[PDB]
mmCIF file of C-alpha atoms and ligand atoms in Angstrom:
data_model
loop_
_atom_site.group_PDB
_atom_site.id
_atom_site.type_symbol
_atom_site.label_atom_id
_atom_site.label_comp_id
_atom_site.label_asym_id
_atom_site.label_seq_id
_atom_site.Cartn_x
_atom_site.Cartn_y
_atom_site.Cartn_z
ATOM 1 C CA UNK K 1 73.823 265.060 -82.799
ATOM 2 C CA UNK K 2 75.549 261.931 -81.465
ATOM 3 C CA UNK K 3 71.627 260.650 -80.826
ATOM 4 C CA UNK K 4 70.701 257.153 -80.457
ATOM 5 C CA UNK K 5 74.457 255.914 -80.279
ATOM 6 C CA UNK K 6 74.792 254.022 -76.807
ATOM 7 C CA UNK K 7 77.985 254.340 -75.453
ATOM 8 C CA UNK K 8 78.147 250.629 -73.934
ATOM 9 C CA UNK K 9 76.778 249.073 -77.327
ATOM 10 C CA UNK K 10 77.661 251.244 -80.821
ATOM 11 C CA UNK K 11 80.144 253.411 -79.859
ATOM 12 C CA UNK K 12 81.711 249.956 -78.874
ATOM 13 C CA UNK K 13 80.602 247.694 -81.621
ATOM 14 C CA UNK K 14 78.955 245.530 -79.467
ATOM 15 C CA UNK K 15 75.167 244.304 -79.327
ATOM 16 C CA UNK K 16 72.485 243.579 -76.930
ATOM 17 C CA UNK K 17 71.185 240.447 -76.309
ATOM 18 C CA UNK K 18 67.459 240.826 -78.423
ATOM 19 C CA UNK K 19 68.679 243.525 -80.481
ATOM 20 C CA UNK K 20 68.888 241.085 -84.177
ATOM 21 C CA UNK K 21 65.341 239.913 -83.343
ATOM 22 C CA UNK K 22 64.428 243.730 -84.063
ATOM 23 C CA UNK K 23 66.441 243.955 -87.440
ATOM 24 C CA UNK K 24 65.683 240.522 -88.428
ATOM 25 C CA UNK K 25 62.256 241.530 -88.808
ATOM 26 C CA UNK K 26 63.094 244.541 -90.768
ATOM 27 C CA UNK K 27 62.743 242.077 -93.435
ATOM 28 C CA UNK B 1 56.320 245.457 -68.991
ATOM 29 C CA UNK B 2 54.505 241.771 -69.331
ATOM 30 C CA UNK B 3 56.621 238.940 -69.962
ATOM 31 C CA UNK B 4 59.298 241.102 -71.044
ATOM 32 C CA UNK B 5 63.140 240.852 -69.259
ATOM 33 C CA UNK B 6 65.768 242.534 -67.085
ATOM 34 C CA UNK B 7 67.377 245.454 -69.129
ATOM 35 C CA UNK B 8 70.918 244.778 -69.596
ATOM 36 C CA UNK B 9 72.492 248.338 -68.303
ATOM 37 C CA UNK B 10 73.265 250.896 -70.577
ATOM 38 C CA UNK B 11 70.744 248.979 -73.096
ATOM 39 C CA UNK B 12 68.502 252.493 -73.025
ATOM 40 C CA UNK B 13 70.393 255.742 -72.037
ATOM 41 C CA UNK B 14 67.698 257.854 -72.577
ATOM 42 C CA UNK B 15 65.193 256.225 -69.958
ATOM 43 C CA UNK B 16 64.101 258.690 -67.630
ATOM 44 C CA UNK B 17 61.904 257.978 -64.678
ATOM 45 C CA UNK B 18 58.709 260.755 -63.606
ATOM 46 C CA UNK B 19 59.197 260.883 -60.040
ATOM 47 C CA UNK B 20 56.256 262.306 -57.447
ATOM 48 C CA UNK B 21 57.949 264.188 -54.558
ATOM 49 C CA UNK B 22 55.378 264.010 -52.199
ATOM 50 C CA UNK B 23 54.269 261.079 -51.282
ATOM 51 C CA UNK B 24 57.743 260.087 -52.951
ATOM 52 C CA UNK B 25 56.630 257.594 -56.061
ATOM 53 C CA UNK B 26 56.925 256.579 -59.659
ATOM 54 C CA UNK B 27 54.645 258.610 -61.933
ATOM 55 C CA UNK B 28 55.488 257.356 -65.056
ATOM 56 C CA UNK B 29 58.557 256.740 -67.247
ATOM 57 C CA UNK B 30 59.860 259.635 -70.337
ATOM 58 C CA UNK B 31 62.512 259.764 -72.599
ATOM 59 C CA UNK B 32 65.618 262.162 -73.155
ATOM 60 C CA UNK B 33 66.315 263.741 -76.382
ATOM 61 C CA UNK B 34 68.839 266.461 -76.080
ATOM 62 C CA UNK B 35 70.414 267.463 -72.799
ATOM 63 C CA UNK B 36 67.419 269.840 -71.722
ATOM 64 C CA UNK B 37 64.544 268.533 -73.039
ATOM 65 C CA UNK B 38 62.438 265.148 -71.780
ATOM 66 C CA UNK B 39 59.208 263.263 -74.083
ATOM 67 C CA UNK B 40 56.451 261.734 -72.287
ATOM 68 C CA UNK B 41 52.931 261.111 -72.624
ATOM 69 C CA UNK B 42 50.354 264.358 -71.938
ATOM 70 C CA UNK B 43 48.483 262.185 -69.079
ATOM 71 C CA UNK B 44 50.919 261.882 -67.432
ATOM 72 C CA UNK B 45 50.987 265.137 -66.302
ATOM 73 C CA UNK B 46 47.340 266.259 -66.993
ATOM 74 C CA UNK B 47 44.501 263.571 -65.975
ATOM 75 C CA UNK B 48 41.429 265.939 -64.867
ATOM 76 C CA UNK B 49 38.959 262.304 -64.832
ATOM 77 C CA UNK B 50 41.538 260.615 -62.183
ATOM 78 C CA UNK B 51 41.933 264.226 -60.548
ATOM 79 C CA UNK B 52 45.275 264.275 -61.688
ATOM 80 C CA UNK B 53 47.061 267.832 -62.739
ATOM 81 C CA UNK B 54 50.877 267.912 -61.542
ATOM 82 C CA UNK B 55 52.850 271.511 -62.060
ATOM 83 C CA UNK B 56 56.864 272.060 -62.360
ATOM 84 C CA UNK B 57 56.981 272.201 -58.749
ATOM 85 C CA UNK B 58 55.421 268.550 -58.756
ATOM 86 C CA UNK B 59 58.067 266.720 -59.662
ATOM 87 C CA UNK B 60 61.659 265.044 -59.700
ATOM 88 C CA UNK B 61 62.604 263.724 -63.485
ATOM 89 C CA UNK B 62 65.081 260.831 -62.753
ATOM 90 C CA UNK B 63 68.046 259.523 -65.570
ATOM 91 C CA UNK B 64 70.565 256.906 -65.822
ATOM 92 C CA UNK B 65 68.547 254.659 -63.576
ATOM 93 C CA UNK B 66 68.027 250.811 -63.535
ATOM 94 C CA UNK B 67 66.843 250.208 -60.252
ATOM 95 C CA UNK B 68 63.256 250.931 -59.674
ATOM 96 C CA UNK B 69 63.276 252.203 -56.262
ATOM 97 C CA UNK B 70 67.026 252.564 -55.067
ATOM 98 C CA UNK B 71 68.781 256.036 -55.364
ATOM 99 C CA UNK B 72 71.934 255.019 -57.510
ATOM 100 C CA UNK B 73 74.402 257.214 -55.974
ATOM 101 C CA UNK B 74 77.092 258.158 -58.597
ATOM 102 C CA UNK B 75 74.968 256.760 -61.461
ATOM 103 C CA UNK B 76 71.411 258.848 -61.923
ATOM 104 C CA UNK B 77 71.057 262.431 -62.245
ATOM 105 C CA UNK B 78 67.939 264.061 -60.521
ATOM 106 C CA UNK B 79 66.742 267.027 -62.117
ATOM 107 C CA UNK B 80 64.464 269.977 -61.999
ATOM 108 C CA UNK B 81 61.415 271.087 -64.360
ATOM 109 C CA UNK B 82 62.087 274.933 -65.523
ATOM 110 C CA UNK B 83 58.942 274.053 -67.416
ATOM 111 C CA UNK B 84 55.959 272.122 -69.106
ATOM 112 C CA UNK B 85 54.481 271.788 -71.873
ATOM 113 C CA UNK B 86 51.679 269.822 -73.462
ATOM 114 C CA UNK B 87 49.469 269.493 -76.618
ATOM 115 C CA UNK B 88 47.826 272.167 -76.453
ATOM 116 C CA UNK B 89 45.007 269.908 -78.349
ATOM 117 C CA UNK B 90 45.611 266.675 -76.672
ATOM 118 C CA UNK B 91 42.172 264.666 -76.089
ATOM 119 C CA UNK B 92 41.829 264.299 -72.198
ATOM 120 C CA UNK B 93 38.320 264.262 -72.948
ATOM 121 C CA UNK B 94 37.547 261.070 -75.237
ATOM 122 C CA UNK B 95 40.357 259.049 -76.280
ATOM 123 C CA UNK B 96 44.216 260.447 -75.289
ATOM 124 C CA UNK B 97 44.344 261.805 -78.898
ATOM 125 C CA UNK B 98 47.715 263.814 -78.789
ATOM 126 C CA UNK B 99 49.414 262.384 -75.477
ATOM 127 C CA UNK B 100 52.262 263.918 -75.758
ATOM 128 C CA UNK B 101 54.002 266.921 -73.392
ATOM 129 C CA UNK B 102 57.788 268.386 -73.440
ATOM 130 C CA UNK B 103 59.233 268.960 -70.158
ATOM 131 C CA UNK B 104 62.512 271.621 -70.427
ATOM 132 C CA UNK B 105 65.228 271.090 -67.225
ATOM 133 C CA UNK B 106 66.183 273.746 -65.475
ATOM 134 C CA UNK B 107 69.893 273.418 -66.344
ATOM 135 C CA UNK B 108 71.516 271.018 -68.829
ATOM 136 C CA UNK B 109 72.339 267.083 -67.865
ATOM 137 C CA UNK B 110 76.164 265.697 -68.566
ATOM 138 C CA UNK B 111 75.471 262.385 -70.947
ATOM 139 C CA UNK B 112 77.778 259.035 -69.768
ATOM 140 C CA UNK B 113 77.721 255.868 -70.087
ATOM 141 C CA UNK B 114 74.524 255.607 -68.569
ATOM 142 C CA UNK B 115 72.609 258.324 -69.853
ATOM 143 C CA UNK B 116 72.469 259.340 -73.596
ATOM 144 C CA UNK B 117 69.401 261.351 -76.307
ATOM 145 C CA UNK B 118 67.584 259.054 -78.267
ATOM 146 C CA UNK B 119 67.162 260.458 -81.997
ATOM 147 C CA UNK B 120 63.394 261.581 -83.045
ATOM 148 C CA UNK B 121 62.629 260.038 -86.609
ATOM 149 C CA UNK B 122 62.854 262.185 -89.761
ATOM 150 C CA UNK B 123 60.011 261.592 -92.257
ATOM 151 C CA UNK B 124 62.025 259.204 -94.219
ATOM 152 C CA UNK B 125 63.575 256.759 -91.685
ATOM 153 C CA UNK B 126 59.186 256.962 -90.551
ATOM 154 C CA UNK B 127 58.420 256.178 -93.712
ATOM 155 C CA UNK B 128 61.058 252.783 -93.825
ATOM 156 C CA UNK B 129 60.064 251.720 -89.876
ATOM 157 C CA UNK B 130 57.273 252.137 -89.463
ATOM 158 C CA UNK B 131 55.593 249.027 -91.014
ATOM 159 C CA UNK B 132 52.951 246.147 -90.029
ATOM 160 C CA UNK B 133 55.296 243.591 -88.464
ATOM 161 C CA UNK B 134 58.420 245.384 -87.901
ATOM 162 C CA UNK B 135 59.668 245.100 -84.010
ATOM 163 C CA UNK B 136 60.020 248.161 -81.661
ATOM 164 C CA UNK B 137 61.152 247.927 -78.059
ATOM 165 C CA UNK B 138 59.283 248.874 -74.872
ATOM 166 C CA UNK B 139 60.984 249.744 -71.652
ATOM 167 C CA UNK B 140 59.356 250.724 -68.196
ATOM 168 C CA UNK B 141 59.351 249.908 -64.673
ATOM 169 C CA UNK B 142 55.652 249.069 -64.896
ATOM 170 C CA UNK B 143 53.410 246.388 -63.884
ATOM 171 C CA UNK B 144 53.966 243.030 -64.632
ATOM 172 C CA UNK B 145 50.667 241.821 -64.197
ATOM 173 C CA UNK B 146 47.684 243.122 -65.481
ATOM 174 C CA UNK B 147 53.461 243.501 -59.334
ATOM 175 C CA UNK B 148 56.652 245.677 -60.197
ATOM 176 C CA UNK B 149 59.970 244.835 -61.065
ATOM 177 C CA UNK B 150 62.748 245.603 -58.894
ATOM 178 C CA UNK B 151 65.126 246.501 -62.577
ATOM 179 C CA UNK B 152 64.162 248.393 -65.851
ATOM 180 C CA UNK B 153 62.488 245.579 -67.892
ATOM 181 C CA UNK B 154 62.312 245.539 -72.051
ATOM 182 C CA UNK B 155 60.272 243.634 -74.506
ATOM 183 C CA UNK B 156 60.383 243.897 -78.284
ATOM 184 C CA UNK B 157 56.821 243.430 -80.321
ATOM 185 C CA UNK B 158 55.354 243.846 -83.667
ATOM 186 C CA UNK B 159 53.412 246.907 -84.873
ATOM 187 C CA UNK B 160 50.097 245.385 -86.099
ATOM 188 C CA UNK B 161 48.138 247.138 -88.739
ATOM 189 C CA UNK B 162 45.093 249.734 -88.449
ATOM 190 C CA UNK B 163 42.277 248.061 -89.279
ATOM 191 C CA UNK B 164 43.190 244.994 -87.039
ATOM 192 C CA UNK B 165 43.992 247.689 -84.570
ATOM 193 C CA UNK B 166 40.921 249.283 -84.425
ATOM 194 C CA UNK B 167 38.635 245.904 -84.446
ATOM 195 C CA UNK B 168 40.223 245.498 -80.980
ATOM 196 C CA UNK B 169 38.361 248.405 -78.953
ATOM 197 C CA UNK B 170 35.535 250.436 -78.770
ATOM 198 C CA UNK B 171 37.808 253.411 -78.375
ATOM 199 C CA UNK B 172 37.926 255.835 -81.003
ATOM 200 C CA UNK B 173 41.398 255.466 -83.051
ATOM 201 C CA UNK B 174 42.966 258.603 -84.519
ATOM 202 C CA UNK B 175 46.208 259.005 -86.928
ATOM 203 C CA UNK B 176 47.949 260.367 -84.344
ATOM 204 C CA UNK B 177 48.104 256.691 -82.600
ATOM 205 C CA UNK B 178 49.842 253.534 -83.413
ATOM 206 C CA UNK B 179 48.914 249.761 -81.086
ATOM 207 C CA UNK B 180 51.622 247.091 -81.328
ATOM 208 C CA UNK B 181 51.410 243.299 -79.957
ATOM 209 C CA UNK B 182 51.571 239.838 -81.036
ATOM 210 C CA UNK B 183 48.247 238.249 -82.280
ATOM 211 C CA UNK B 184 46.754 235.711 -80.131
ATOM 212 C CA UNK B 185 47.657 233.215 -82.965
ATOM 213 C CA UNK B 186 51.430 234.149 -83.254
ATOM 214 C CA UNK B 187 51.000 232.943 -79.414
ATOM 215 C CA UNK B 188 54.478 234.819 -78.081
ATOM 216 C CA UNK B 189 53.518 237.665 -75.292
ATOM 217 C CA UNK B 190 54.541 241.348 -73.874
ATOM 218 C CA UNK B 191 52.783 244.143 -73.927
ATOM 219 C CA UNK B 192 53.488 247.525 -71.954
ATOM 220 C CA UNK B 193 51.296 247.897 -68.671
ATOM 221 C CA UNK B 194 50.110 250.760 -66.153
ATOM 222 C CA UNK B 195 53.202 252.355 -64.729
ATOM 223 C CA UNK B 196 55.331 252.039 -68.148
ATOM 224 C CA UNK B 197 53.021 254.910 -69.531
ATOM 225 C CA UNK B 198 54.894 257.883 -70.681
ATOM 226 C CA UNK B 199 58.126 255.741 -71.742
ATOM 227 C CA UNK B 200 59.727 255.253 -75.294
ATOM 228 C CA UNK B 201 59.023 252.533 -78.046
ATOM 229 C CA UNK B 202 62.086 252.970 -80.266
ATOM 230 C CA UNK B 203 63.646 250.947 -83.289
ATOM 231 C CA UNK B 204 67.127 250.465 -84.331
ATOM 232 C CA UNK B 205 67.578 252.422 -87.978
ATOM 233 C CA UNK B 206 68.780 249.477 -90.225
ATOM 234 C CA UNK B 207 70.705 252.695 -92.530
ATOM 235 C CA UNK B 208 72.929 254.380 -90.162
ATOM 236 C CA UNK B 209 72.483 251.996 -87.162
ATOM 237 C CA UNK B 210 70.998 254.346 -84.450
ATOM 238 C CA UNK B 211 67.644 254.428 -81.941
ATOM 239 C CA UNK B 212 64.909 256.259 -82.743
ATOM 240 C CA UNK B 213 62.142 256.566 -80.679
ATOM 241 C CA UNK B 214 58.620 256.426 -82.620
ATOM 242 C CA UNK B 215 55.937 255.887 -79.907
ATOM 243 C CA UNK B 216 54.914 257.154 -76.598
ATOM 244 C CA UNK B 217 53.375 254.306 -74.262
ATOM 245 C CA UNK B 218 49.899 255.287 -74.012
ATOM 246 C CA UNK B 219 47.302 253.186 -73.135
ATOM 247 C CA UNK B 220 45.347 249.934 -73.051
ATOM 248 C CA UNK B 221 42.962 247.900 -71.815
ATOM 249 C CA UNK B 222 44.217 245.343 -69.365
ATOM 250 C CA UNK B 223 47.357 243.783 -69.888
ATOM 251 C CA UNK B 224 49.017 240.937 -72.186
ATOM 252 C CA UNK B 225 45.255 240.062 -72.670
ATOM 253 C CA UNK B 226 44.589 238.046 -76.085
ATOM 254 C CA UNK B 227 43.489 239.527 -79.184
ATOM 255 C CA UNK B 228 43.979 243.309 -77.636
ATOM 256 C CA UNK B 229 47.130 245.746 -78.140
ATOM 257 C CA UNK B 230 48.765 248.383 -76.503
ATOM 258 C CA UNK B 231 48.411 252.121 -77.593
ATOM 259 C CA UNK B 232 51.065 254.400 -78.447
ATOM 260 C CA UNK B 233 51.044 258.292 -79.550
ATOM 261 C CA UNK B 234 52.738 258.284 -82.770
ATOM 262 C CA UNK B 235 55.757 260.625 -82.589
ATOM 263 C CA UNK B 236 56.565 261.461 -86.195
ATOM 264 C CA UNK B 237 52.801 262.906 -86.494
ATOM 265 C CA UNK B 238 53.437 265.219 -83.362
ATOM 266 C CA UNK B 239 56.630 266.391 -84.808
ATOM 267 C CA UNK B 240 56.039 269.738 -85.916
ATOM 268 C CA UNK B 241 54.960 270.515 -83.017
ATOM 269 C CA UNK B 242 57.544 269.466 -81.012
ATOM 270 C CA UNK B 243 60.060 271.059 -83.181
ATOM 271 C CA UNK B 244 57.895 274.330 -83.301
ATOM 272 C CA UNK B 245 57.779 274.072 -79.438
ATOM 273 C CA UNK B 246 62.239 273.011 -78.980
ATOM 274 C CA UNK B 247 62.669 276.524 -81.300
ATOM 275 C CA UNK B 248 60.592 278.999 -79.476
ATOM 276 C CA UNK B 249 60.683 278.422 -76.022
ATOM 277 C CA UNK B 250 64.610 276.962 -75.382
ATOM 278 C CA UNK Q 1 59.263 250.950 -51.346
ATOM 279 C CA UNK Q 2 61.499 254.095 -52.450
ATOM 280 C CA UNK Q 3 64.949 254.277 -51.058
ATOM 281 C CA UNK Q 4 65.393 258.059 -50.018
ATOM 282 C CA UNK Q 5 66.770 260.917 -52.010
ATOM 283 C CA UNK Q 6 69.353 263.420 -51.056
ATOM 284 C CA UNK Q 7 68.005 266.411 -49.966
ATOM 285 C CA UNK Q 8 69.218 269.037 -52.713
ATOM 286 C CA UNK Q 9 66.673 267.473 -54.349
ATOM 287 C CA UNK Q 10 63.825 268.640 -52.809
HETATM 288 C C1 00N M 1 50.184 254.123 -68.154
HETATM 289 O O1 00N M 1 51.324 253.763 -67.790
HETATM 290 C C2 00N M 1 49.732 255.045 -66.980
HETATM 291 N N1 00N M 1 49.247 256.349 -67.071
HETATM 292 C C3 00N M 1 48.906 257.209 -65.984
HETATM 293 C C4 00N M 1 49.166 256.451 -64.889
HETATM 294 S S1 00N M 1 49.721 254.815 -65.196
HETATM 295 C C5 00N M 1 49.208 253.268 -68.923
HETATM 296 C C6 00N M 1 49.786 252.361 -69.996
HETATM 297 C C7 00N M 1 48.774 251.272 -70.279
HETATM 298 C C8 00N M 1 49.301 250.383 -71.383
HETATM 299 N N2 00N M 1 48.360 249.315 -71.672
HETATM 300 C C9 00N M 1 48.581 248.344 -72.575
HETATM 301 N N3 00N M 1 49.744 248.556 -73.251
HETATM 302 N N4 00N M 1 48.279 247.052 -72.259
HETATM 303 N N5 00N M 1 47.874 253.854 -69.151
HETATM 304 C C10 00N M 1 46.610 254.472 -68.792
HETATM 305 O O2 00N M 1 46.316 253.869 -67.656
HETATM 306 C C11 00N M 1 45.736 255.365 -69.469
HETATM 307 C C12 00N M 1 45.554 256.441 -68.457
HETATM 308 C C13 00N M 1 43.995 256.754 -68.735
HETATM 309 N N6 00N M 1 43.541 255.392 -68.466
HETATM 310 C C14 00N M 1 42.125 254.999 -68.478
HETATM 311 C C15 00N M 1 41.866 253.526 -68.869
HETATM 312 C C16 00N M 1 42.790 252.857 -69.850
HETATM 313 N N7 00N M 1 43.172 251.461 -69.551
HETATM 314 C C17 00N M 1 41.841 252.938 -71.161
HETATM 315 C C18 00N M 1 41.567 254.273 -71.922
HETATM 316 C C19 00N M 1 40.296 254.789 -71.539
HETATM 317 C C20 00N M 1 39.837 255.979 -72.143
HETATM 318 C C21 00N M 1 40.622 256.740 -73.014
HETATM 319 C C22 00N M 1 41.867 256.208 -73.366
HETATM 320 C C23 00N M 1 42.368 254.993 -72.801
HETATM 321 C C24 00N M 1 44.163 253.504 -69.949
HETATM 322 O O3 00N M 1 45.006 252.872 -70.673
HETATM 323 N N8 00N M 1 44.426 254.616 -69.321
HETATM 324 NA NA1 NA M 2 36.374 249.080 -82.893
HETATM 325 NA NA1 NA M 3 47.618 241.237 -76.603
#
C-alpha cells in the first residue's frame, strides 16, 4: 500500500537522526 | 535495547506493544502491517517450558505508543485480538525454529501520524538487504541491562554472517534465523534484550526509500555480551506462510 | 509501574 512511508519523516522529506548510518552501509 | 537511544516520535509507526491484562504488564513488543493484522514472535504467545500459553482473551495489543508505561490519551489505540495464529511448526521444543505468530484485530485501526504498516520484503528487495554488514534497526521497550526505559529506545547493528553466527552458541541454527551485532573487535555496542522480544528489525529500501521489516527479535544469550549476537526469525523465509495465512482467514 | 487503562478496554 502506502507501507513503510512514515508520515513525520518521508511523506515529509525529512530524516531521522541515525537513519544515513543505515544506508551508508548499504555500501 | 542495550546501549541503544530514545526513539525520536513517529521514528517507527508500526511499533506495537503486547500488553498482559491481568496482572496489567508488558509482554513483548510486535509490529503492524496492514490495519488488521500484527507480527510477533511465536513465544511470545506460546512458551509451554516457562508455563507460558496466553489466548485472545489474554491480551491488550497497544499502537502509537512511546511511553513505556503511561496510557497516551489521544495518541495510542488499544485493541482487541479476534484471533491467533502461530507456526503451526514453530520449534518450542529445541531451538525457537519458526517464532513467528499473526495476531488479526477485531476491527480495523485508523493509521496517523503516529501509527503506520511497515512493508514485508519481496524476494528481491531480500535478496539486495539482506547482506553480512548491512545495518537494520531494533526497537523495544526492553531491558537495558543484561532496568527499563521509561521511552521506546532504537539501535541500528550489522547482520553478521552464518558461520560466524553459529560459532557463537551451542544452539542449533536453522535457515529460518538470522543473529546481528557488532564483533567484539569492531568494539561499538547494542544488542536487543529480554522484553524487546517479539518487535521488528527493519531496513530502509535504498530503491524506493521505504521500511521493511526483515527480522523478528528472538532470542539470545545474555545481553550486549562480547563475541555473542542476538537472534532473529527471518521474515522473508516465513513468508508464504504468512501470506497463505493473510488470504484464508481475513 | 503501568499507568491505568480506560475501562472499555477490558
Ligand atoms: C525476548 O524479548 C522475550 N521473550 C519472552 C519473554 S521476554 C527475548 C529477546 C532476547 C534477545 N537477546 C539478545 N538479543 N541478546 N528472548 C527469550 O528470552 C527467549 C525466550 C526463550 N528464552 C530461553 C533462553 C534464551 N536466552 C536462550 C534460548 C534457549 C533455548 C532455545 C532458544 C533460545 C532466550 O533468548 N529465550
Ligand atoms: Na556452535
Ligand atoms: Na555481542
Amino acid at each position: 500500500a502506502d507501507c513503510g512511508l512514515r508520515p513525520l519523516f518521508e511523506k515529509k522529506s525529512l530524516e531521522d537522526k541515525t537513519e544515513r548510518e543505515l544506508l551508508e552501509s548499504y555500501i | 535495547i542495550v546501549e541503544g537511544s530514545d526513539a525520536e516520535i513517529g521514528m517507527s509507526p508500526w511499533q506495537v506493544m503486547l500488553f498482559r491484562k491481568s496482572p496489567q504488564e508488558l509482554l513483548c513488543g510486535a509490529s503492524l502491517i496492514s490495519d488488521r493484522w500484527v507480527l510477533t514472535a511465536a513465544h511470545c504467545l506460546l512458551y509451554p517450558p516457562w508455563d507460558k500459553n496466553f489466548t485472545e482473551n489474554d491480551l491488550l495489543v497497544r499502537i502509537g505508543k512511546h511511553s513505556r508505561t503511561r496510557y497516551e490519551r489521544n495518541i495510542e489505540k488499544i485493541s482487541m485480538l479476534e484471533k491467533i495464529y502461530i507456526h503451526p511448526r514453530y520449534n518450542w521444543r529445541e531451538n525457537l525454529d519458526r517464532d513467528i505468530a499473526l495476531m488479526k484485530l477485531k476491527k480495523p485501526v485508523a493509521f496517523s501520524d503516529y501509527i503506520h504498516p511497515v512493508c514485508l520484503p519481496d524476494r528481491e528487495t531480500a535478496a539486495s538487504l539482506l547482506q553480512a554488514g548491512y545495518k537494520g534497526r531494533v526497537t523495544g521497550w526492553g531491558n537495558l541491562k543484561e532496568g527499563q526505559p521509561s521511552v521506546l529506545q532504537v539501535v541500528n547493528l550489522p547482520i553478521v554472517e552464518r558461520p560466524v553466527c553459529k560459532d557463537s552458541t551451542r544452539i542449533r541454527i536453522t535457515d529460518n534465523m538470522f543473529c546481528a551485532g557488532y564483533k567484539p573487535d569492531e568494539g561499538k555496542r547494542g544488542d536487543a534484550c529480554e522484553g524487546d522480544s517479539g518487535g521488528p528489525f527493519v531496513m530502509k529500501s535504498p530503491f524506493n526509500n521505504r521500511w521493511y521489516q526483515m527480522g523478528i527479535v528472538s532470542w539470545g544469550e545474555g545481553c550486549d555480551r562480547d563475541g555473542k549476537y542476538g537472534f532473529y526469525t527471518h521474515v522473508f523465509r516465513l513468508k508464504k506462510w504468512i501470506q497463505k495465512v493473510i488470504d484464508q482467514f481475513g | 509501574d503501568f499507568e491505568e487503562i480506560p475501562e472499555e478496554y477490558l
